Prior knowledge:
Order of helices and strands of chain A: EHEHEHEHHEHHHEHHEHEH
Bound molecules: chloride ion, sodium ion
Oligomer: homodimer
Amino acid sequence: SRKFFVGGNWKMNGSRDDNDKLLKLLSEAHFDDNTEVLIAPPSVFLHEIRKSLKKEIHVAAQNCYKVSKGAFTGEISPAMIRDIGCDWVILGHSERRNIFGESDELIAEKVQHALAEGLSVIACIGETLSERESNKTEEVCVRQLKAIANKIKSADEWKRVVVAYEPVWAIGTGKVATPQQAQEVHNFLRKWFKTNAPNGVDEKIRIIYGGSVTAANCKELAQQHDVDGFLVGGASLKPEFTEICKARQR
Amino acid sequence: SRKFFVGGNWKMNGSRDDNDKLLKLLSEAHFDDNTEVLIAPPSVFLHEIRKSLKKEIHVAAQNCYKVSKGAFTGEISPAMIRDIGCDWVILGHSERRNIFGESDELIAEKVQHALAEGLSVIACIGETLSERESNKTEEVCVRQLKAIANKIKSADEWKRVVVAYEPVWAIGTGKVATPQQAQEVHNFLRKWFKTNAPNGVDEKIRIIYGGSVTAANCKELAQQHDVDGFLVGGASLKPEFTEICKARQ
Lengths: 250, 249
Ligand SMILES: [Cl-]
Ligand SMILES: [Cl-]
Ligand code: NA
Ligand code: NA
Ligand code: NA
């Protein structure tokens, strides 16, 4: 059975005093062996947070670039992420795709490079409100996923990928996908893997939901057949995050 | 008189081992009191490098965004840069403009925000080979500078700005600008500041040159009347960086 997976995307939020309070709450929570837990702080805090935080909790960069070093002022590399002792990265987040213009191919290139360095990847996909209204949800999701899958050449590589489906219109808007909306997307996503990725990957790959997940709505979403966890944004800065990590419990 | 200013832009280069060997040579060197020195490591190394390095050497983030917090996955804010104890940021670098498509206006919004947060800012401008060959150098530099100046409303803000002129065709190409080409742009920029910034900014603002600066070419550039220093890229990873910092001598 796929291990349940809850990541917390802090986005552009953090400071020594705020981080210390949040990490104190995280360290004191008790997470069962059945739940895999990840936080993603801003890049300037990654090294110190990884040093102090227990190793059962992942510490991810929120973005990285697609080569180990070079003339890319402002960018960090998977080698740099490994050098500071972190093992994960979020790639293709909608804010990077939309506000910063990162293309499908750029995300695919980043994912392939991160996997080549030994990282695990949360690879983000999703459709806008207008794309959904035009009944393009699957077309858009499958385009973004296919670009990434085209650079993943073996089934072993897919073991270090978690797919996050986040409808753009649910991100930070308070407007979560209904449990039926989420299950329906994740189901055709898993079917796409069954058809298009190496045998067996469909049954192992975690597909997590993101977009206005809170403690008030996380339990019904977690009971959905093809939902394997969450990418939590605004709520990952609050005490209720530890409650969202228990989403599968009664 | 304006203090000589030398910055090292590491770009996307850095690791605990490589950083340690670099900072040792840098922490052992001796610079005269009229030289201001700055390094700019990748964001993941900023905090620990700032903690261990003598305060007189600045440590700059290589980029930041234009508000203090929000839903901008992968970005960092002036407030975070200050929280980890750094007081500088490079904004508007050629690589952000020409690889990541940062517009003049986005750059100007960033500078205004970093300045309002109390940071000091290296603001980069410069023209392409095509632009230079169309005799568009001054028009391009002014367009870029003017977007920033529009958001800056005080000599006090301009006090914490260092302008880096970096011809795009000189960055990483081995084609440095001659002392004469550099001086010609720097003199024109200082003239533009006299009319387009509050009184006295032109006399104060450091205009530093960037683009294939090496220990082999820096002294002649440093002698030009309006060149106040250097933004150094590839050579800033090498021991000869400390020589470039001594270019006025
Ligand atoms: Cl980790
Ligand atoms: Cl500093
Ligand atoms: Na640790
Ligand atoms: Na198959
Ligand atoms: Na004036």
